[PDB]
């Protein structure tokens, strides 16, 4: 069949989204969730990891089909996908299958004709709506929407049109908003009564790295999830380079009733982790100006567990074999142990700080260096070489290992 | 009398560009006239004459110019400007941004046809509004109080919960007790989840028989936004000034309206204002915002609550900037309060209501309401200055009085501002939550309050 | 008397030097970067006009 | 088939303004065609058709419009777009920025005439680059490894030694010979002498091709100079099967000439007044690199940049970093401290490094050691920044370990001197020695199985 790429394919009804799009990152899946039918933006300066997040999400997500769009970006970033995806396999019925069997690609690299970048976007979303109508859950990656906005600026410029913000045409916001409205979860047309979805994950490439960029500023008015990357995390090799202070998701109130059924313990842990990071951010300016010696032992513990979470939970190298993909059980198990250590270390100080003989974080460190090195090592446990049972058994052993040390204070 | 004479139909299309079609050989063209376009495939669109000169007319097309051509497409000129049908049967109906039904009901069988620009109400014939709307929200009713017949926007930004504040005002609004609103709701450029949220809330409240909805979603045509506020306000003016209802009008993103103006102005190659917006943006916005309030000898009223998404959180941007020069206040929704899970995220410092001065106080609400609002404001202003100093110097530099202001700042955000989405507080609960914070200080610090108000309400 | 004064005064010297270093190495650079950005963006708005 | 029908010549110049000449009564104009202009004094100049409309053609003139007139100036239209004559004789030649010889040798006998603009390679036919080049420079090889076929520019600034680093890379590159194609845009004569001298001093010159546009040469030649050079690299790599290293000298001179050309046409400006399409334009140069299916040859690009006022957010280094596969960053603060090479690793990157290293490629530790050296260097910088506020007496011994690593890293791993040629294996073991300072439980980027094999030596 033949369809006009600029016209939305019809459906019986759009539906609320009720199920997570798992990315296999610990950050993203815990702190800033996304859904089957969701809309996401990934803004960030050059080298932050936008294409590596797009490729990781393409390799490891819970989607039936992937449509991958590379408008205005590198030919080697397309060639990597063609080289990798035949070799990498998912498992079906006790049999392995190449993930290239579920993938389609739409390439228009940074040296191909500028006008064709508009056609890449509408081709890729039309291909995504076609498989949605079969009752599949589809994900579309658009590895830079700034390259499309920048193509509109040249065509608009040669048509001699009046510019809006920074040379872009006044219709740019309407072109973006009507593209993101093609995402969703649906009752399909026709009569076998199936349901399907399209999630859209649009990367954004703000010139100068500043999110006051017209494309970023327009896109953040439209999307429901924002994964804002930071170059000063990327320079430390802190990956994914996501700024957890500015990033957000609007789907948390929709997903809480899923987590209450499948991962009952997670919502308190998510709440505590955000508070520990928010407290460490409030402490860090006082530490920088005043020089740390003023801090109470609660605040030393809060800085130390915030550092533990930042360095050994949020951080995840995407190439090394144990952390390519992090399952949600591994993610909840790791988080539960770090938050449980916070509550035990705080309990020990908060119970004893009134007495003549009392606990301090220096005592806790010196007493527990082996348990601290076990907590930092939890990330190295491997989802396929060790497996679920061995991972969950080890994380329960760390809980007794730290409990015996706190029974011993 | 009627237009009984026939309508001319022209195939003389001469240019097509963005939202605009240009025709020539047009007989005695009329400015602001409506045009109906039949495409080569028989699709029907509609448009309006933005300029006339000699035999040439420039038409903005509401549904967009895709598929139009310079030979087969034909325009029928209606002989008249845009008049909408109206009736009281429009309450409990759902329409698109063009005013066509989407509830699967019939089209409006009119009680009248009204010009969507309205008619100028004489400044001699207006009534000054003094009845307070109790919105049920303490940060509004205590410090930014709203009169029935006011124009007062919510200024907000991307990701913030301005839709929940709007829905909560619609659930909870009434007069202070020592009538209930007809609601007209317009949406420009909203996503499907926003449209579903408001429609679902009015059904959840069990009150859809008293509300009219006009919806233009983010996939619907952008030039329909030019008329959507004017369909909504023309309906509110019939209901208020001919059927004597008390109307509340919600206009849910003025920022996506102002962008549709910038497209048309850019396509016409007009001389810019700031950030590329039309040079006439103030004078256009004023035609929407000044359709509000009360008139002498008629029992109904219109209260206006626009909503703005401010870009980059910039309150000096031409959209929120010009809105303050026309409306009687603003309510400001703040990212720093939202990031801390405070709800409502209303920041009381940049928020204002210009008509509150005469709507509150003795006989209106309670005799302390003016004094308590001033003192709560001054305490929060001082506490925010102490907080900003403290981060430089540490708590060892602060006096016992600086700790009284810094304690108040927490207790105020925790108890007075923070409320939750279905909690409804009277003015009386709002004031007496207020006094529990003013008791943090000794009497000698409460400088905004006269001794009679201290003597009567502090000892309790 | 002299020694308890001296201990208190040593701490006050250390605190004062810490503040001088913070103004010189944290606060002034942050203001000067901010000022340079504003001066740059005003030229960009002017070129757009 | 050959263009056998004769060329038209025109005196119909209807106007002149800026770098643009405007002919009328032109018979069937061709967009992007080349035109030869003869001035009244008999000087020849060339230009290219930048616009066509009915009987009119707009020409930009490469040597400028000064002394052109509406009456005596005459234009000959070539019937064709800009093509360059190419042969394998071009190695061991020197040309100006428009491809005319300047070595007193003859003009090129073509083996073919190639379109200067190249042609986009199909992403299906690209081969991902995975063979590591050893430059022997430890700050590159150990922490920004270069694959054969990469684009990896040198971001530098005025007064820094980016010429000397680029010469050292040309002198030392090999697998764990290159043909060199070198372009210069807007160089001073002492820069032009430095490279030509160094290539003759290393005896290499019979295997180097140079295109020179100096600071006094025409500006609009600069926008064809890298396209002449890359067309020569594409013949040498993808028809003669050679491995080519392409050096493009000061891309900021290319971008500045492009801004000056575009400002005369009044095309939409981007940031800091550069053309709205500058990303696309630079991408047509930088994407002319890599390996391809079924052919042995390859093109590696190392463009050199000058950052205005050392600002990496300026559109030139910014839009270049968005396209290229990393960057090497040359730092004024290391240069002022008399270190060589001044390569600050933190703002630097290589994207193709991740698959060009490790087991079978280099050594099993390489991917772990590199990431731990980045972590300790970033933390050492944070402690040095803390010290400037609170002074040494506030630092714990753990802070002093990172601040000792910092000093030893810049003296042993970074500092090298201009002719030292370290193996990857020397670079890796110099890596482990600095990491050995820290008690092993601090090495939290490295898994137990790597630590227990390499740290105890
Ligand atoms: N999750 C990650 N894990 C490991 N390395 C990463 C990760 N994300 C980014 N990188 C490194 O950073 C480089 C640049 O990432 P990329 O996605 O191409 O950034 P960009 O936003 O510019 O497209 C990668 O080639 C890789 O070397
Ligand atoms: Mg990318």
UniProtKB/Swiss-Prot annotation, chain D:
GO biological process: ATP metabolic process; regulation of cellular pH; synaptic vesicle lumen acidification; vacuolar acidification
Record Pfam families: ATP-synt_ab, ATP-synt_ab_N, ATP-synt_VA_C
UniProt binding sites for ATP: 351
Principal location listed in the UniProt entry: membrane
Known tissue expression: Expressed in brain (at protein level).
Keywords (A to Z) from UniProt: ATP-binding, Cell membrane, Cytoplasm, Cytoplasmic vesicle, Hydrogen ion transport, Ion transport, Membrane, Nucleotide-binding, Synapse, Transport
UniProt KW Cell inner membrane keyword: no
One Gene Ontology molecular-function label: ATP binding
GO cellular component: apical plasma membrane; clathrin-coated vesicle membrane; cytoplasm; cytosol; extrinsic component of synaptic vesicle membrane; melanosome; microvillus; plasma membrane
Lipid bilayer topology: Peripheral membrane protein
UniProt-annotated location(s): Apical cell membrane; Melanosome; Cytoplasm; Cytoplasmic vesicle, Secretory vesicle, Synaptic vesicle membrane
Taxonomy, superkingdom: Eukaryota
Assembly with partners or alone: V-ATPase is a heteromultimeric enzyme made up of two complexes: the ATP-hydrolytic V1 complex and the proton translocation V0 complex. The V1 complex consists of three catalytic AB heterodimers that form a heterohexamer, three peripheral stalks each consisting of EG heterodimers, one central rotor including subunits D and F, and the regulatory subunits C and H. The proton translocation complex V0 consists of the proton transport subunit a, a ring of proteolipid subunits c9c'', rotary subunit d, subunits e and f, and the accessory subunits ATP6AP1/Ac45 and ATP6AP2/PRR.
Family: Belongs to the ATPase alpha/beta chains family.
Protein's name according to its UniProt entry: V-type proton ATPase subunit B, brain isoform
Organism listed in the record: Rattus norvegicus
């Amino acid at each position: 069949q033949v369809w006009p790429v600029r016209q939305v394919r019809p459906v019986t009804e759009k539906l609320p989204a009720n199920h997570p799009l798992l990315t296999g990152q610990r950050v993203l899946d815990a702190l800033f969730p996304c859904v089957q039918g969701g809309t996401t933006a990934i803004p960030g300066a050059f080298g932050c990891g936008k294409t590596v997040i797009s490729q990781s999400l393409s390799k490891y997500s819970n989607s039936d089909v992937i449509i991958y769009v590379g408008c205005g970006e590198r030919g080697n970033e397309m060639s990597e996908v063609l080289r990798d995806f035949p070799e990498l396999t998912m498992e079906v019925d006790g049999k392995v299958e190449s993930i290239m069997k579920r993938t389609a690609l739409v390439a228009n690299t940074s040296n191909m004709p500028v006008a064709a970048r508009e056609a890449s976007i509408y081709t890729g979303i039309t291909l995504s709506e076609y498989f949605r109508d079969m009752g599949y859950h589809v994900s579309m990656m658009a590895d830079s929407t700034s390259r499309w906005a920048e193509a509109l600026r040249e065509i608009s410029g040669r048509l001699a049109e009046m510019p809006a913000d920074s040379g872009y045409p006044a219709y740019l916001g309407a072109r973006l908003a009507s593209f993101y409205e093609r995402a969703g979860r649906v009752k399909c047309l026709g009569n076998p009564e199936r349901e399907g979805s399209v999630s859209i994950v649009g990367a954004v490439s703000p010139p100068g790295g500043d999110f006051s960029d017209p494309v970023t500023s327009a896109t953040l008015g439209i999307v429901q999830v924002f994964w804002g990357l930071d170059k000063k995390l990327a320079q430390r090799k802190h990956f994914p380079s996501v700024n957890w202070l500015i990033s957000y998701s609007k789907y948390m109130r929709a997903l809480d009733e899923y987590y209450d059924k499948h991962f009952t313990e997670f919502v308190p842990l998510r709440t505590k982790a955000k508070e520990i990071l928010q407290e460490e951010e409030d402490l860090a300016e006082i530490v920088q100006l005043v020089g740390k010696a003023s801090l109470a032992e609660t605040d030393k513990i809060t800085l130390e567990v915030a550092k533990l979470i930042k360095d050994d939970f949020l951080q995840q190298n995407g190439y090394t074999p144990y952390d390519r993909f992090c399952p949600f059980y591994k993610t909840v198990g790791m988080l539960s142990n770090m938050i449980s250590f916070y509550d035990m270390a705080r309990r020990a100080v908060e119970t004893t700080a009134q007495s003549d003989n009392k606990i301090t974080w220096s005592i806790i460190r010196e007493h527990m260096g082996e348990i601290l090195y076990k907590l930092s090592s939890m990330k190295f446990k491997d989802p396929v070489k060790d497996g679920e049972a061995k991972i969950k058994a080890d994380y329960a052993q760390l809980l007794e290992d730290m409990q015996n040390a706190f029974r011993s204070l | 009398n009627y237009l009984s004479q026939p309508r001319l139909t022209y195939k003389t299309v001469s240019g097509v560009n963005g939202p605009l079609v240009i025709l020539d050989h047009v007989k005695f063209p009329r400015y602001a006239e409506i045009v109906h376009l039949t495409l080569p495939d028989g699709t029907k669109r509609s448009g309006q004459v933005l300029e006339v000169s000699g035999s040439k007319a420039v038409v903005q097309v509401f549904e967009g110019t895709s598929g139009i051509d310079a030979k087969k497409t034909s325009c029928e000129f209606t002989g008249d400007i845009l008049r909408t049908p109206v009736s009281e049967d429009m309450l409990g109906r759902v329409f698109n941004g063009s005013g066509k039904p989407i509830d699967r009901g019939p089209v409006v069988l009119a009680e009248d046809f009204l010009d969507i620009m309205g008619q100028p109400i004489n400044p001699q014939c207006r009534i000054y509004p003094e009845e307070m709307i109790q919105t049920g929200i303490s940060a509004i009713d205590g410090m930014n109080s709203i009169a029935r017949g006011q124009k007062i926007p919510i200024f907000s930004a991307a990701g913030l919960p301005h839709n929940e504040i709007a829905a909560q005002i619609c659930r909870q609004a009434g007069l202070v007790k020592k009538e209930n609103f007809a609601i007209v709701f317009a949406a420009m450029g909203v996503n499907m989840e926003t449209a579903r949220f408001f429609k679902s809330d009015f059904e959840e409240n069990g009150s859809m028989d008293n509300v009219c909805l006009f919806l233009n979603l983010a996939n619907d045509p952008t030039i329909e936004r030019i008329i959507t506020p004017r369909l909504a306000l023309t309906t509110a003016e019939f209901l208020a000034y001919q059927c004597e209802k008390h109307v509340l009008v919600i206009l849910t993103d003025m920022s996506s309206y102002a962008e549709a103006l910038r497209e048309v102005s850019a396509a016409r190659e007009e001389v810019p204002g700031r950030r590329g917006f039309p040079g006439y943006m103030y004078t256009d916005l004023a035609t929407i915002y000044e359709r509000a309030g009360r008139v002498e000898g008629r029992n109904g009223s219109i209260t206006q609550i626009p909503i703005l998404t401010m870009p980059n959180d910039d309150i000096t941007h031409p959209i929120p900037d010009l809105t303050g020069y026309i409306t009687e206040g603003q309510i400001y929704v703040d990212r720093q309060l939202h990031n801390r899970q405070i709800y409502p995220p209303i920041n009381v410092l940049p928020s204002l209501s210009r008509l509150m001065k005469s709507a509150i106080g003795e006989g209106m609400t309670r005799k302390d309401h003016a004094d308590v609002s001033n003192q709560l404001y001054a305490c929060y202003a001082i506490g925010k200055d102490v907080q900003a100093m403290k981060a430089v110097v540490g708590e060892e530099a602060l006096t016992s009085d600086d700790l009284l202001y810094l304690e108040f700042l927490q207790k105020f955000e925790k108890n007075f501002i923070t409320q939750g989405p279905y909690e409804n507080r009277t003015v009386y609960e709002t004031l007496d939550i207020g006094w529990q914070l003013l008791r943090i200080f000794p009497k000698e610090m409460l400088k905004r309050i006269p001794q009679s108000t201290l003597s009567e309400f502090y000892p309790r | 008397s002299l020694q308890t004064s001296f201990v208190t005064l040593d701490e006050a010297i250390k605190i004062t030097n810490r503040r001088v270093n913070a103004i010189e190495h944290v606060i002034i650079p942050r203001i000067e970067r901010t000022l340079a950005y504003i001066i740059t963006e005003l030229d960009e708005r002017e070129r757009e006009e």
